[PDB]
């Protein structure tokens, strides 16, 4: 009978960097997904394998709400079957994804004159992430045959890059807050 704590996710003051994406497990509660879809405060609300309207009539064992910040031109990568810096090295959705991807412009909260250096992404990785894999490692990347031993230099690079969000950037370089709802024993979360 309790409402699902969606407000803690969508209205959080701080969001995580994509490399260190947050996951909120939703359990034992009731959820109005049409209320979310009816806010219309979203530039992206794409549902895969389900209908936003029919979500209010379904039940699931576990709902996950993943949350992070990326740039506008990278929102397209938050979808099944996609490739790119985010999908390959930061946040990967499965090809059979059953859930919803919601995004909104956050230039008013996440950008700063002089640059916000708090939001980062992984630029350097040897291999692709598996679906729902989180890599928070900060080890020096070896681009050559010589081991780096924690020392930056030729062929030895820090793996993370700041987005440096500035308000004067175009929409593609501007910050976007993203919430991925994943719908998965007994059901615990249901709609009305």
């Amino acid at each position: 009978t309790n409402l699902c704590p969606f407000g803690e996710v969508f209205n959080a003051t701080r969001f995580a960097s994509v490399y260190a994406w947050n996951r909120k497990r939703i359990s034992n509660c009731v959820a109005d997904y049409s209320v979310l879809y009816n806010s219309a405060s979203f530039s992206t609300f794409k549902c895969y394998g389900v209908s936003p309207t029919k979500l209010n009539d379904l039940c699931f064992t576990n709902v996950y709400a993943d949350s992070f910040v990326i740039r506008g031109d990278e929102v397209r990568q938050i979808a099944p079957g996609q490739t790119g810096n985010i999908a390959d090295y930061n946040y990967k959705l499965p090809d059979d994804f059953t859930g919803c991807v919601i995004a909104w412009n956050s230039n008013n909260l996440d950008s700063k004159v002089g640059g916000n250096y708090n939001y980062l992404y992984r630029l350097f990785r040897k291999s692709n992430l598996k679906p729902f894999e989180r890599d928070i490692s900060t080890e020096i990347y070896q681009a050559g045959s010589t081991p780096c031993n924690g020392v930056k230099g030729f062929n030895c690079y820090f793996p993370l890059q700041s987005y440096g969000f500035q308000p004067t950037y175009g929409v593609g370089y501007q910050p976007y807050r993203v919430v991925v709802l994943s719908f998965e024993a007994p059901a615990t979360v249901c709609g009305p």
Partner: antibody, heavy 116, light 108 residues
Framework: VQLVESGGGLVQPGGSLRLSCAAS????????MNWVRQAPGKGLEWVSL???????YYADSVKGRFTISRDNSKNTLYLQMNSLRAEDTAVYHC???????????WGQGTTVTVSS | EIVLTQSPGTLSISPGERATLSCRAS???????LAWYQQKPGQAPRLLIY???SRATGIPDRFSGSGSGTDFTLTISRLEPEDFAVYYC????????FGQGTKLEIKR
């Protein structure tokens, strides 16, 4: 540290050609790697890119015709070029891309001529 | 997609003077992905500047870069004869794009 391109030559329109780039001092499979070409008397044109993790991307002018790949045990990058056209005539360079640090390592290039 | 327009197409100067080469992006973009290359006649391109303002390894002090948003600048502070060449700016959005090149020629 060097990249050495091989395989350039004369090909008929509609033909195919595989370019190779043998690296030393970087590991191809650990890097963003590009092919960049330069038609005679023209400017630089990015052609194709491969990520360390295998994702590939192509310029619209060569999409569906060119395939970038690599052989880790030979530390070598390839460009397979099919359905070649006269406008593909150029010097083809391989380059290692550091994205935020630029393309720091460039090969001297290999010349491709497409003509009837 | 980002389109880079360099200006002027040809710059005509004398040894010892200061050169100012411009690169205009069609949208406001991040400076961390802006690079400049030199191509001397017959040779491959050579990285001069990365991240808009950082000099690459072994590049002489007279080369410097600056700018932000849509307007980026390469400045060569005291031209030497070997500096007369073609210069390309480059941006990395989701893949590399190049400007069309500025020729630096000797004035007479």
């Amino acid at each position: 540290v060097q990249l050495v391109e091989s395989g350039g030559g004369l090909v008929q329109p509609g033909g195919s050609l595989r370019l190779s780039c043998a690296a030393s001092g970087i590991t191809v499979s650990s890097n963003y790697m590009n092919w960049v070409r330069q038609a005679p008397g023209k400017g630089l044109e990015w052609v194709s890119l491969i990520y360390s993790g295998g994702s590939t991307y192509y310029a619209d002018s060569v999409k569906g015709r060119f395939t970038i790949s690599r052989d880790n045990s030979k530390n070598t990058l390839y460009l397979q070029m099919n359905s070649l056209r006269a406008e593909d005539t150029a010097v083809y360079h391989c380059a290692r891309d550091l994205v935020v640090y630029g393309m720091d390592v460039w090969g001297q290039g290999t010349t491709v001529t497409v003509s009837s | 997609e980002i389109v880079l327009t360099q200006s002027p197409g040809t710059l005509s100067i004398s040894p010892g003077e200061r050169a100012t080469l411009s690169c205009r992006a069609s949208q406001s973009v991040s400076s961390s992905y802006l690079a400049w290359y030199q191509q001397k006649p017959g040779q491959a391109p050579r990285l001069l500047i990365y991240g808009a303002s950082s000099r690459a390894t072994g590049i002489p002090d007279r080369f410097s870069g600056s700018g932000s948003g849509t307007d980026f600048t390469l400045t060569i502070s005291r031209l030497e004869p070997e500096d007369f060449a073609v210069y390309y700016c480059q941006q990395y959005g989701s893949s590399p794009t190049f400007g069309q090149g500025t020729k630096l020629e000797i004035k007479r």
